[PDB]
Design a binder for this molecule. Structure first.
Ligand SMILES: C[C@H]1C(=O)N(Cc2cccc3ccccc23)C[C@@H]2N(C(=O)NCc3ccc(F)cc3)CCC(=O)N21
Ligand SMILES: C[C@H]1C(=O)N(Cc2cccc3ccccc23)C[C@@H]2N(C(=O)NCc3ccc(F)cc3)CCC(=O)N21
Ligand SMILES: C[C@H]1C(=O)N(Cc2cccc3ccccc23)C[C@@H]2N(C(=O)NCc3ccc(F)cc3)CCC(=O)N21
Ligand SMILES: C[C@H]1C(=O)N(Cc2cccc3ccccc23)C[C@@H]2N(C(=O)NCc3ccc(F)cc3)CCC(=O)N21
Ligand SMILES: C[C@H]1C(=O)N(Cc2cccc3ccccc23)C[C@@H]2N(C(=O)NCc3ccc(F)cc3)CCC(=O)N21
Ligand SMILES: C[C@H]1C(=O)N(Cc2cccc3ccccc23)C[C@@H]2N(C(=O)NCc3ccc(F)cc3)CCC(=O)N21
Ligand SMILES: C[C@H]1C(=O)N(Cc2cccc3ccccc23)C[C@@H]2N(C(=O)NCc3ccc(F)cc3)CCC(=O)N21
Ligand SMILES: C[C@H]1C(=O)N(Cc2cccc3ccccc23)C[C@@H]2N(C(=O)NCc3ccc(F)cc3)CCC(=O)N21
Lengths: 177, 179, 179, 179, 179, 179, 179, 179, 178
């Protein structure tokens, strides 16, 4: 409905990540984070996440912009945070990462593709393995789990309840009503 | 869509939210935003969620469900036309005593739908996840209807069409709004 | 669509709602919102529902039907061009004495259409549901026309085209609006 | 489409309605709304319906036709470019003495087109309906042109192209507007 | 298709003709050629027409029908699997006393299907032709079954599925071939 | 297609030619070759041209027509199933007294179909050519049926469906072959 | 497909018939022809029907079923790879004591699949027909397995995968052929 | 492609069967027929199954596997190019001591692949079935290789590419055939 | 294709045509022809004529191993083009009996492929195609006399050779002059 509803929530420092993460969505979220820091460098931002994931580089545009700005960015999972979505949920300010009780969190390894000559396939494989090491290291730091446990637990699609995500260290609290 | 504000925005000003389509992430994110906005405008006055939906994404439905239970205002639910699948789940999720259907509205309940492709172990993970999702939906529907988990399981095995009056007998709504 | 307000929004200001397309959930949700808005503006003055529609979704049609019967104002119905299937059902649903057609407007009645694919038991569920839907439509049409259920069943077995005058003799409308 | 209001909205302010496309339900609903609005603004002053149309839906055309005959103002018709099929029917439907074409405008008359698929009895129902529709169009064209039903039937058997002057001799218009 | 001659050619040597597909002109021309060839080989010995067909072209079916009635040998008909529409017509066309179905074979009768597009008068010609075709099929079915034309008309209004035993009671076949 | 020689080659050995498909250049060239071959085998014995065809190319049809009239043997024609358009023209082209239809065979006559695209003068050339083609077909049909050119023109204006008996009354065939 | 005769034709010479694909009318007509041919060669010696099939048309399957029961020789059935749906029905239809599966072969039973679109009464006819077809399949499966109709109904409600040993315990086969 | 009998048929005369494609029902039915034919020609002499296959249908693979174990002759297996998935399963299924690979041939083992769409309970049935299929494949591979079920499970979790020499160390073959 | 068809008449003289892209179907046909010719006569030369843009590496290795396996020498003759696995099979003919006609083209390059899915699936596919390349390069080294390092460098991109250059490289033994 139409300020449109999202613009009115942005006035209260609420950003919606409510779709697949591509470059357009990431550029919108980065712009909103930068704008909110300029409006007030001290007050919390609320990043609400309902996303099946998407582009790793687009996800890292959002991740780095969160860590760059001065305000704490709270994260709240509603519905689902899968893949890069769950990475960004875990990237919220320490003590301010939440999920609502019936929200789902899914973690897994990065997906990609490579076509062409053996040496091109080698370059693409080395790059996606380095990307996975980078994602896993940051998830280790943000969850408190070892790199070896994160590697094993992301080998395949791993679905967590809100409560299990909290036990894992992906969030700090389940927001009960 | 006519203007007075477009018609939906004018109804939102009176705390009326329309769920009038298939439930996907875009629709859920719109409904969640409207619920949060209405709570900020007035944390005490009732909200009116009108439902004409064939259902859709279970996770999108749960974004709406958890946002309803999270906010302070009671959310009334009114079924007009049809509430099927996740649509009927959200109809049942309205504030106790304030779940309604108009007399010719249809309610349909059934088990979740999905897909799985790839290696045996990937199919196993997808099967375990959709069975756990069904247990979660059935448990909440049990709490909101007063029916046993075993009855909900049996009654959702296939497409199960209810009249407004049958939805009330089932405990999915509290009253049929007669004219 | 020209401006004066777009033309439809200007008509809505005079309590005129246009049903001028196929009936789907989006069209029904727009019409329901307009009916609720007009009731809130004035609970006593007539509303004018103008119908040029080939029909569409039965559940979407029932969202409109139940909203008409729910609100306090009389809803006049006027058929201009064509009212077929759920369109003719909604024409017959207007306030008693205030259902009209212009002289060359066409009214068509027929049984509901649908589909079913899959297992024998899924086809059985879909068949039972569409037969119950037809019984529901025929019962209400009987009440609104004064015709017996048996006559409506026979007369809707196939596409049945009526002139405005025949629709009036049938009891689908009260008057032909002559110039 | 330029601005001064878009150009069509500025013409509507001077009681000029453009029928400049294929006739479907959307176009008919727009024209009907404009006729009703112009009658509400002034029930006495002429309306100008300018026609450049290859025709289209018969029922949509009849929505326009009946709305013209219903309202109190005279509706002048002016053919610019082409009036074919239902377009030429609506050209002939203007107020007596106020139906015009510009000198190089084309008018085409022909019988209605359709289709029918399915069982023998469904094909029979569709054939009876389109023949009754043709009888209805031909009867009204007879009344508005002064030609006999037999002549209209023969002259519409195939595509029949008329000059502005021939349309006037036929009684489809009253005058060729000379510069 | 195996070899021994392909299997169908070996059966043709024993005066067995297979109608095992949809009836089109190619299938009909093959069957007509086989009937003529078998009559030339021996004008006295029975021919065996085995039918597993969902039907198809009425004119192609009548090529087969008239060729059966034309030649001197009796043509036995045996339904194996299904004889629907023109397939069931040809099953009923076998020599009196020599029309069979195996116990689980299905017979379906219904009215002819077709289509028509274009001008009202083209649709009228197509409708008249398919109604005359239906009268022709029903008259011959009346003669071959012993049922009245009125009963055949009513019983073919919609898809009518018969067991082998019901086909025999109806007079479409003379006997169920039991093992 | 079964073997005994394939079935068509065995019938050709008895001077039977099948025209059992749409007439295109390939079908015409096959039929012309068969007529020439049969004349070379025996210049005195009758040939039997069996026709089940919806028609097709006029020039391909005239390849067959002129080859029939050119060779010394009489060519009998037998309509089985349907002879439409150029098919019915070739049925009428059989030796006088030896043109037959089976009782339930259908005959259809109508004017030629075609197309034209491009400049006005190209469309004029294509229109003149198809009108001259129609004059040529109607003149020959007049000679073969005994009907006047004026009657053939009127009767072929639209699709005209004939029974075997009506085809005989028209002079398209000499006899209905009764069983 | 190699030569020695193609390999299938060489096996047919030893009274071995391959059902190694989806069951459609073409496959059924081939199998029916092979059964009839083998009975004519020797009315006493066993026939070997080897089955690796995901199923297919129920009427095509019944053409095969009835032809098996009709002929005098015992037809052994051997499941190699998979017998699903109509495939498992035909496996169960082999001569008593001569129905086999190899140890790793899979048998799957489930209810028939179909579809229906159109008017409520057409959907009702299609639903009644597929339910009657399922009763017919279940009755015969009851007779051939020794299981009750009610047990077969419950066990075929969804896809039910059996090992060779489970198929034997069920009564679908008599023995697992061990090496 | 080449003739001498096609080249494959000439090799079959020397008891050589070539599996050079994806394993589907058609390929499996051809291989099963060739194995049965060769056993009938000589129940004692070795058969040579040469394998270059990326795998395919598990049930089709098991048709071949069970037919190999059923017949009396030893079936040697020789991998040339690649044996992946069901291809490598069949390579391992050759007579003990007579399973070979040429030095540059690749062997790949991995878990079965599939898919499932629909209701939670349908996905559960499909998941249980593919997990049971994997247990069956792994048990037989354990028996034929000498590896534990737990090692086979771990080693097939993902695509596992082996050289000829590694396949021999694993127990999938007995020897690398050096030139 | 004229009439035995012409290819079957050449097969009667122990001539096999590899005249298309190499896939499993073509490899299975060539393997069958090699086995058939060995059964007809285990001593006389076979003539494998190659006009092929290459194709599947595993299909190519089915042909390669079948050539080395059978007892007869298999001569190779390049007519038109031998690219990729085509040029690998040209180099695989019996020592001293690998030929090209003077205007025939030979092209060598590294293997092509693809990989989709999880990081670990991409890793498995990359390791496999790199091992396949090491295997091709090692065999080409043995058959040409060039070092593995030179073959690696020379196959990094599409490398087009004349018949004479293919002979200097050791991919063939002689240019068949008229
Ligand atoms: C910090 C510095 C800078 O490096 N950038 C680059 C930049 C560009 C786009 C996205 C970024 C995301 C993360 C980090 C840097 C990004 C822009 C920024 N500016 C502001 O932040 N200006 C307040 C502002 C932001 C948004 C807005 F809408 C209004 C004002 C203008 C003045 C300036 O020096 N800077
Ligand atoms: C409750 C708390 C919080 O955790 N969030 C996070 C959040 C973010 C996105 C979606 C959510 C959905 C459900 C529950 C929390 C969600 C936002 C909220 N805020 C407000 O509600 N602010 C008034 C407001 C809302 C909307 C509007 F338009 C204007 C004002 C900002 C102040 C604050 O502490 N909170
Ligand atoms: C005559 C009567 C009525 O039956 N209708 C229904 C109607 C709807 C659509 C098209 C129609 C065409 C022909 C005839 C009736 C049509 C609307 C009309 N109204 C007006 O004309 N109101 C001034 C008005 C109209 C439009 C506008 F933009 C402003 C004012 C509202 C008051 C009222 O009683 N009526
Ligand atoms: C009757 C009751 C209620 O159950 N609903 C639910 C409802 C929601 C959506 C569609 C419906 C359709 C038919 C029937 C109920 C529908 C809304 C209504 N409200 C109003 O009608 N409010 C005036 C209003 C409407 C529109 C507008 F722009 C301004 C005010 C808010 C206060 C309230 O208690 N109610
Ligand atoms: C009865 C008469 C005739 O009108 N025809 C025309 C005809 C043609 C095609 C299909 C037809 C189908 C139904 C009825 C007539 C058909 C052919 C027939 N002939 C034979 O039957 N000849 C023995 C014969 C038949 C088939 C065969 F393979 C060998 C010989 C040639 C001699 C002859 O006078 N006649
Ligand atoms: C009549 C004359 C002639 O002008 N032609 C040309 C011709 C060619 C192609 C199609 C034609 C169609 C219609 C009319 C002429 C056609 C061929 C014919 N010939 C024969 O008929 N030869 C016996 C023959 C024919 C066919 C066959 F299979 C065996 C012998 C060669 C001897 C000869 O003088 N003639
Ligand atoms: C063992 C028994 C049997 O159960 N079958 C069924 C069967 C059918 C299809 C595939 C099968 C695969 C594996 C096992 C059984 C298979 C066929 C077999 N027969 C032969 O093997 N006959 C020699 C033969 C075969 C083919 C051929 F061309 C010539 C001779 C016919 C005589 C007989 O009793 N049997
Ligand atoms: C029993 C009777 C009959 O009703 N038919 C019809 C029929 C046709 C096709 C499949 C059928 C399957 C089951 C039952 C009837 C079937 C054909 C059969 N005939 C034979 O079986 N003939 C020996 C034969 C068969 C095949 C073959 F290649 C050679 C000879 C011709 C002689 C005869 O009276 N009959």
């Amino acid at each position: 409905p139409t300020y449109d509803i999202y613009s009115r929530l942005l006035k209260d420092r609420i950003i919606m990540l409510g779709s697949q993460i591509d470059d357009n969505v990431a550029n919108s979220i980065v712009s909103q984070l930068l704008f909110l820091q300029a409006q007030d460098s001290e007050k919390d931002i609320y990043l609400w996440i309902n996303s099946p994931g998407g582009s790793v580089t687009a996800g890292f545009a959002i991740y780095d912009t969160i860590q760059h700005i001065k305000p704490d960015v709270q994260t709240i999972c509603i519905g689902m945070a899968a893949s890069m979505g769950s990475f960004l949920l875990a990237a919220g300010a320490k003590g301010k990462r939440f999920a609502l009780p019936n929200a789902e969190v899914m973690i897994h390894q990065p997906l990609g593709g490579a076509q062409g000559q053996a040496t091109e396939i080698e370059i693409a494989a080395n790059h996606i393995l380095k990307t996975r090491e980078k994602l896993n290291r940051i998830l280790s730091e943000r969850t408190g789990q070892s790199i070896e446990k994160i590697q094993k637990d992301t080998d395949r699609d791993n679905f967590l309840t809100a409560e299990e995500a909290k036990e894992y260290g992906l969030i700090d609290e389940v927001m009960v009503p």
